[PDB]
Amino acid sequence: ARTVVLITGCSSGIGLHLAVRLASDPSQSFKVYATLRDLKTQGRLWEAARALACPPGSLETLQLDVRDSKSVAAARERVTEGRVDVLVCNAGLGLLGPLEALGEDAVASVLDVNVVGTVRMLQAFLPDMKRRGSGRVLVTGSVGGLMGLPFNDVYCASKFALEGLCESLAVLLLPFGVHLSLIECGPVHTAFMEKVLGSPEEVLDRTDIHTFHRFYQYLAHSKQVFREAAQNPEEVAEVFLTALRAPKPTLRYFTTERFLPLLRMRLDDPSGSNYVTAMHREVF
Amino acid sequence: ARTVVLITGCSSGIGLHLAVRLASDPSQSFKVYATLRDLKTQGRLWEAARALACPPGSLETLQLDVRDSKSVAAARERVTEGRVDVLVCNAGLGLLGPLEALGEDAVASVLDVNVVGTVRMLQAFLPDMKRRGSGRVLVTGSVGGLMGLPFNDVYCASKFALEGLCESLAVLLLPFGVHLSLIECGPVHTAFMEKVLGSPEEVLDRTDIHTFHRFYQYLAHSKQVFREAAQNPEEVAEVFLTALRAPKPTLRYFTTERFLPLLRMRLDDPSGSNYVTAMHREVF
Ligand SMILES: C[C@]12CCC(=O)C[C@@H]1CC[C@@H]1[C@@H]2CC[C@]2(C)[C@@H](O)CC[C@@H]12
Numbered sequence A, B: 001a002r003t004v005v006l007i008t009g010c011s012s013g014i015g016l017h018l019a020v021r022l023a024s025d026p027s028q029s030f031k032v033y034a035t036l037r038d039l040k041t042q043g044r045l046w047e048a049a050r051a052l053a054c055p056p057g058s059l060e061t062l063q064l065d066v067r068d069s070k071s072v073a074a075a076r077e078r079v080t081e082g083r084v085d086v087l088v089c090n091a092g093l094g095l096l097g098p099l100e101a102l103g104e105d106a107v108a109s110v111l112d113v114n115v116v117g118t119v120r121m122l123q124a125f126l127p128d129m130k131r132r133g134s135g136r137v138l139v140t141g142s143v144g145g146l147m148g149l150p151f152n153d154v155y156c157a158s159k160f161a162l163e164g165l166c167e168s169l170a171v172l173l174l175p176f177g178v179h180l181s182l183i184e185c186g187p188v189h190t191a192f193m194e195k196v197l198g199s200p201e202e203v204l205d206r207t208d209i210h211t212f213h214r215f216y217q218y219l220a221h222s223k224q225v226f227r228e229a230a231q232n233p234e235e236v237a238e239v240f241l242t243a244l245r246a247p248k249p250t251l252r253y254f255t256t257e258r259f260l261p262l263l264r265m266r267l268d269d270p271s272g273s274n275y276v277t278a279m280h281r282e283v284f
């Protein structure tokens, strides 16, 4: 019938655009379940959905807290068609700042949402896809999950986690008929993201003036990279679709090639000394 | 004076051997703080310490729960010399079994201990090392942190996390004078490990007979790899020492080269299709 897709973290960014991009497809081959943690944020999903003229019933909204298995279970039961053909694990949190400046709860929230939240989604949805011998799971990756970035230690950790988690499953799912693929995104044009970067005094009292100085320096550098490398979510969202459609999807898809040169030098030197070096100069 | 080293997870394996290997050094240049989560497990650390004839006062035991920052802070204050020259982040948990068969708390414990526990150690100890402009941090890695392994999804995730976390910091610590290095271990001869693998009925009721069958199949395969590739902890522990002594340590040290061929094919194909394939055949 119609491909049933459930996407997490749809209140903005990639999740939002992908949801409406799927539900608004001229072919109307997709039934989308856009879940968000807080429903008071569905506004933009809906205004965006009116903008693309998604036919009614092509887009349903669900409250889903990936930090809660009960919510994960309850939303899974809201899928009237009693089946999900494409599960998109997109919900994710960021974290920028000196390691010593990051609150313990903040660190725990990012791993809990980004990694364990994805585990819960996989636990609740993988079984049936395995039983039915079919299904596709897509997980939003990040260049940060492929290489470490200064002041993104915990973010990268959780993104790296996702790589390990999916690669591990991938080895097991190969003969099962269910496909898992990571979508490695570089910066994705977001006006708020470039706004999130800029923490003076609060970070200053939680770290030394030399680390602090390097933070600013790194903020300045991300700023540039964004303003000259950021991709439109319409563009990134189109990669999910490419993967979702590939008859034999690969474990991972890259939304850009800009960061591929850096990634190569990463395994052109397993000792990590070359990358840490290129990347340090690269940012400072 | 004497190099002060604090090691976590010393109740067994690498932590234990490294602790006594450092404290028993003929040169006696090291003062060791072997922390363990439960003191009722210090027996083997001590019997091992008598075996190597560690001079009295070369080895102090501390209760440290890396799942608790208060415990992390309290043990940090137990370091009488008011300084740590070498911090070894070794505490870690394993997890084997179908993703759907893993308890939520179990998944959360492994990330909490392996990743966030390491964050807390880094948060509490990095500052001073940064201030003093010197210090070495070593983190026990794993081949599982460099490539995904079936039925080790959550273990690999946390190990992958550690890679991201350390690589991120590494970029920032380069000019600071504090060195961070990961010690990537392959299997390390442990009679209990080969015993931990073997969960019939309990795992059977939490997953399908086909996944279950593949689990057994994978258990069988690890069994072999261990019985013919496992390294003595004395051997692995000697790598920590190599790193601890290198004037310019690299971000990572490999205890063996057995798994290096597999790791290369991992970035000789960023799409992951080659590795997932080699590794699947490799295990099944
Ligand atoms: C690592 C990069 C790219 C290269 C670099 O030297 C620093 C810079 C810092 C911000 C990163 C950016 C690439 C895309 C990331 C990882 C986004 O996903 C969120 C933060 C962005």
Ligand SMILES: C[C@]12CCC(=O)C[C@@H]1CC[C@@H]1[C@@H]2CC[C@]2(C)[C@@H](O)CC[C@@H]12
Residues within 6 Å of the ligand: B142, B143, B144, B149, B185, B186, B187, B188, B221, B222, B225, B279, B282, B283
């Ligand atoms: C991945 C390997 C090695 C290669 C393989 O095909 C499967 C096998 C499964 C058990 C792993 C082992 C290497 C070392 C590990 C990752 C230990 O650290 C703990 C479990 C071990």
